[PDB]
Each structure stands twice: as C-alpha cells, then as structure tokens.
Structure 1
Amino acid sequence: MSGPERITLAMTGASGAQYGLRLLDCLVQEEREVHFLISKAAQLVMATETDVALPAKPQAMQAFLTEYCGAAAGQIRVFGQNDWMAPPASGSSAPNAMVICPCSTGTLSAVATGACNNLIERAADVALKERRPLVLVPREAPFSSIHLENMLKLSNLGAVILPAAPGFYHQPQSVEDLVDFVVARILNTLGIPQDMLPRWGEQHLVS
C-alpha cells in the first residue's frame, strides 16, 4: 500500500464541509484508518451547508460516519476536543498523516503560533514536531497578510498549504466534480491512490 496507513482528519470551521466528508469517504474506500476530529464551529458549518445530520457526541458520530462511508468496524475513530488520551495528542503515538480540511483561518493561526487550545491544534503541533505529514486546506477569500504570514511560516517548515481552489481543466459538470478535484489533490499529496483526477500529460510523448 502506498501512502500512510492512518490519517488524522480534522474538520474546522471554514466553509467547505463537503470537501472533508468526501475525503473521509475516499480514505475509507482506500482502507485507511481515520482518526476523525471536528470542531464545534465545523459542526455548525456542516449543519448550515449540508444535509448531513451529524450527531454531537463522539460515539454516535463514530457510528453515523461508519454507516455514511461504509467503513469497517473501528476503521473510523472519533475523538472529542479535549481528549488528551487519544493518539494524536502525543508524539509517542503511532505515526499518521494529518489533514485539516477545511482549515479555518483561526486554526491556521493556532498551528502557526503553536497555540494548542484543543486536540486538533495539539495534533498539528505534534505532527510538526515529529516531522509527520501535515496538510492544511484553507477556504477563505481574500487572504489577508495575517493569513499569508501564517501559511508561509508553516509551508517553510514543511506543511503543505493546499487551498480549496479547484481547477477547471477536467471538464467539471457539477459542484461534486469541483469537490473531487480538491480531494484528489489531497490524496496525491499524501501518496494515496485516486482515480478522480487523471495524470496530466501521461500519454503525451513528444512536442
């Protein structure tokens, strides 16, 4: 298997809940283990923008998402926002890649400054200290200089700043096809197989 066995998927309070759910579903189909974290603001976004009725408490959430994705028994683990007993809270945990999708500008700030105010922020702090993959998927416009400084600092440290900025070069027909572009880019970054976005120019031999 190419790519990581385990992904920590954190959803925070930016627009774009559909990207995080689609990623969750793709990861499950590629038989990966997912450690799923969601902020209170992200729960309000998912309520506002989607018709996914996600239960509030972690065990009910775990059961709902397991059904939603067709996941195996304990393939998706759900941890609450202060559960310091969860693997992402410590660098002594087994290695996983982390993706924050969508990543609010407030979460981006916390990760860039080291704030650790909750498990998502601590998980990212641990990813950086242990040199484990960290992918941030902001969805904001305009980006202010505050945002850009925080992204630059993190990029220079080896985090991947992957904005929710879909391309249009594979004839998208629906909102879902734009969602799938961004998700495909995340999986490419992680080294996980995907077949939603072809390899550019792969059959072009010369000219």
Structure 2
Amino acid sequence: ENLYFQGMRFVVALTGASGQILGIRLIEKLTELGAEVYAVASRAAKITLKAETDYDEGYVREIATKYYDEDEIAAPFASGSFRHDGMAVVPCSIKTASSIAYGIADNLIARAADVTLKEKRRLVLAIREAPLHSGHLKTLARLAEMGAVIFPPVLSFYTRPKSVDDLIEHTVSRIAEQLGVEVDYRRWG
C-alpha cells in the first residue's frame, strides 16, 4: 500500500508476554502494506505461542521478510550502521522492557532495541503487565526518557468491537501508527 514506495523496513520482536497474536498480526499488517519486516521471537515468546495459540512454531518465520532467533547477536540490525525505519516489541514483557531500559542487552531483541534508541530511531514497546508496581513505573519512565513509545495494549471500546479480532485490529493499527505508518482503520476522527 503506502510503505513500499519509500521501501520501509521494520524490526518486529515478539517476547514472552501474553498477546502473541498482536505481534503476528502486526507483522501481517506491515508486510501487506509493502514494508519489509525483520522478525525475532524470544524463547519465552515461542513458549507463550504454544500455550495460548494454535499457531505453528514456524509461522512467524514464514510471514517475515527475514527471521532471526534471539541468540543471533550478530544480525544486521545489531549495529547502528544498519538502516531501518523503526522497531516494535509486540507483545513486550517486563523482562525485555526492563532489559532495554537498563542496558542489559544480552540478546538480539534487547540489543536491537538499544541500537534503535541510540540512533534516535522509533521504538514502540507494547508492554503487557497488570498491575504495574512502582519499580515497573520507574522503568517505563526511564524508557520514555530514552525516547521509546510506551503502548500498554489496553482494551478499547470506542470503535464498537464485536469480536476479539476487532480488538486486535484496533490495537495493532494503533501500534502501527506509532511507527509512523498511516494505516487505514476505524478512528474516532
């Protein structure tokens, strides 16, 4: 659609929080619109996928432009000299959000996110946990100060959703807008 003309490419990482379908649908949306997606899924994300979905273990690799596991710490986007247009961690665990906040860049996901931030590229973190305690909130404040977009994947009813897929589509569209993507979807305005 409107992402191949400028030839966009995004990093999308899935981590071990509930909501694997959100990252899968975001990858599907971005590639449909003509962007390249470099995808990574952590070991805990693969465990969560099995726990809460019926997706095949290879589906993310199949729909991505290029696929990396989390120990591929020499992947191209582990260096700031590799150009890309934004990274999303969807869904984002506390563990990965915190690893990014504090620089515990011990796998490809945290390192790629740190590289995204240091180069002042867009980073969107769909951080799923509730409640959030004071330590979580201090971590999210630090991430916001570092430039990350903090996007709790909250329930939203103002678009009159009728199915689970309706909720997923709204949240995925909203996350895509944080990457600079001008997605078409049902807005309040």
Give the TM-score range, shorter chain: over 0.9
> Given the alignment of the two structures, is residue 193 of structure 1 paired with residue 189 of structure 2, yes or no?
no
Alignment match, 2:51: 48
Deviations 1:61-93 (A, max 9, x none): 63xx23xxxxxxxx6100122223312210011
Gaps in structure 1 of 5+ consecutive residues? 67-74, 202-207
Q: 1:140 aligns with which of 115, 124, 129?
A: 129
Give the RMSD, CA atoms, in angstroms.
Answer: 1.7
> What is the alpha-carbon distance in structure 2 between the residues aligned to residue 4 and residue 110 of structure 1?
30
Tell me which amino acid in the other structure corresponds to 2:144. Answer: S
Q: Tell me, yes or no, if the aligned pair for 2:15 and 2:44 is still in contact at 8 Å.
A: yes
The count of residues paired between Structure 1 and Structure 2 equals: 186
Alignment match, 2:108: 119
Q: Tell me, yes or no, if the aligned pair for 1:166 and 1:181 is still in contact at 8 Å.
A: no
Alignment match, 1:69: none
> What is the alpha-carbon distance in structure 2 between the residues aligned to residue 14 and residue 142 of structure 1?
14
Q: 2:28 aligns with which of 25, 30, 41?
A: 25
Gaps in structure 2 of 5+ consecutive residues? none
> Given the alignment of the two structures, is residue 173 of structure 1 paired with residue 147 of structure 2, yes or no?
no
Alignment match, 1:184: 173
Q: 2:8 aligns with which of 1, 5, 10?
A: 5
Q: CA deviation at 1:22?
A: 0.8
> What is the alpha-carbon distance in structure 1 between the residues aligned to residue 103 and residue 76 of structure 2?
18
Given the two structures, how large is their TM-score scaled by the length of structure 1? 0.85
- % same residue: 41
Q: CA deviation at 1:146?
A: 1.4
> What is the alpha-carbon distance in structure 1 between the residues aligned to residue 7 and residue 18 of structure 2?
26
Q: Tell me, yes or no, if the aligned pair for 1:4 and 1:191 is still in contact at 8 Å.
A: no
Please give the residue correspondences for 1:15-164 in structure 2 after superposition, counting only pairs within 5 Å.
15-55=18-58, 62=61, 65-66=62-63, 76-164=65-153
Q: Tell me, yes or no, if the aligned pair for 1:14 and 1:104 is still in contact at 8 Å.
A: yes
Q: Tell me, yes or no, if the aligned pair for 1:127 and 1:133 is still in contact at 8 Å.
A: yes
Q: Tell me, yes or no, if the aligned pair for 2:24 and 2:60 is still in contact at 8 Å.
A: no
Tell me which amino acid in the other structure corresponds to 2:110. Answer: E
Q: CA deviation at 1:196?
A: 2.6
Tell me which amino acid in the other structure corresponds to 2:42. Answer: S
Structure 1 runs of 4+ with >3 Å offset: 1-4
> What is the alpha-carbon distance in structure 1 between the residues aligned to residue 77 and residue 34 of structure 2?
20
Change (3 A) 1:195 1:96: closer
Deviations 1:121-156 (A, max 9, x none): 000110111101000001111011111111111112
